[PDB]
Amino acid sequence: EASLTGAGATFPAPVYAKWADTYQKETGNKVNYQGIGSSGGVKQIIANTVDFGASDAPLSDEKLAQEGLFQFPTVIGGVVLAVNIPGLKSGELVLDGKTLGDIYLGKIKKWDDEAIAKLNPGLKLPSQNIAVVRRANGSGTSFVFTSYLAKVNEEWKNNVGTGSTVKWPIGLGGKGNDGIAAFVQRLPGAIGYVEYAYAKQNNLAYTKLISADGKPVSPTEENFANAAKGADWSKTFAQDLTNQKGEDAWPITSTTFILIHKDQKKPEQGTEVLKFFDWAYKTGAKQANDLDYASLPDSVVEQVRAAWKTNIKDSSGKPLY
Numbered sequence: 001e002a003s004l005t006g007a008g009a010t011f012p013a014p015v016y017a018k019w020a021d022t023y024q025k026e027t028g029n030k031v032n033y034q035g036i037g038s039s040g041g042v043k044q045i046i047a048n049t050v051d052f053g054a055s056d057a058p059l060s061d062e063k064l065a066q067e068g069l070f071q072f073p074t075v076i077g078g079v080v081l082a083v084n085i086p087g088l089k090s091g092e093l094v095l096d097g098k099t100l101g102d103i104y105l106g107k108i109k110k111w112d113d114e115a116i117a118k119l120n121p122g123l124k125l126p127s128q129n130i131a132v133v134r135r136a137n138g139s140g141t142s143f144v145f146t147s148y149l150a151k152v153n154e155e156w157k158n159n160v161g162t163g164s165t166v167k168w169p170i171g172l173g174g175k176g177n178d179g180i181a182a183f184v185q186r187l188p189g190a191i192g193y194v195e196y197a198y199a200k201q202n203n204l205a206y207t208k209l210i211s212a213d214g215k216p217v218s219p220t221e222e223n224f225a226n227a228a229k230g231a232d233w234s235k236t237f238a239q240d241l242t243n244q245k246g247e248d249a250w251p252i253t254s255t256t257f258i259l260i261h262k263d264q265k266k267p268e269q270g271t272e273v274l275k276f277f278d279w280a281y282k283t284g285a286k287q288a289n290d291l292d293y294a295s296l297p298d299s300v301v302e303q304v305r306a307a308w309k310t311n312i313k314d315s316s317g318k319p320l321y
Helices: 013-027 038-047 061-067 097-104 114-119 140-152 154-159 176-186 196-201 221-227 267-283 285-290 298-311
Strands: 003-008 030-035 052-055 069-083 131-135 172-174 190-195 208-210 253-261
Touching: 003 038, 003 267, 013 030, 013 069, 013 196, 013 267, 013 285, 030 176, 038 052, 038 140, 038 253, 061 069, 069 140, 069 176, 069 196, 069 221, 069 267, 069 298, 097 114, 097 131, 097 140, 097 154, 097 208, 131 140, 131 176, 140 154, 140 190, 140 253, 172 176, 176 190, 176 196, 190 196, 253 267, 267 285, 267 298
Parallel strands: 003 030, 003 052, 131 172, 131 190
Antiparallel strands: 052 253, 069 190, 069 253
16 A cells, blocks of 8 residues: 655646545555645645646646656546626526636626626626636636636737736635635625636536637536547647637636656655556546546547556666556
């Protein structure tokens, strides 16, 4: 039995924790996962204070080569806009990218703004002020969200840009996906971006969004999977899944990555990390779907296995898989 420690992204934390509990029950192996944000996960793996790091923002091939790291995707999730609007039920408000950007730029300040009313003809919107909530920590969810806004709102792209940390025009700061969930819950009129599981688990209302093709879509595991149907995984695991074309393609979708060292100084730990992720691919799909995360296609998991064999070795050059 081994004790493993991982750290990083809160985006997939609900599923990593579920897998860890089940894995211990079946095998006795212990996996301790710390949700400290993707930036923190990257610093930790490079500092070698953990067996594996986790980040929703992929590292470039050069940065991976420079640090002697290897990265692989685990699941596909989606970012949603959790809202606290009195009188509105979940899934009934619809927003488009342009308007969402104008809300985050501070251009739109009330829930009954003309720009929002026009997108929601049947709705009777309140003249409630909007309280914007964003991440206070270095975040892979912020990276995905800002990558999306830069595509749909030019003023956002030119003035604030994309990043795991940016100079937010307005808004209160919440720590982790759980921190944003807690804020929305306690602030009438609030809007905040979180990975879907956090909204669902906390019974938070969320909005629909207009797809890249121009149709309103609901956030569901299937619709996150739809956003990834045209990604060519054979070329690279670092796929951008925001604003993708296609029927029922959730616009703010993303996969997430695990980072491990190519030259394993503690081979026994390295071997056990791969066994845990292999077990998750083989048996953990049901748990991932229970939490509304879509699974990676079998072809992709096969590419990852082929890559483990070629890349992960001990100091004597022997493969650990």
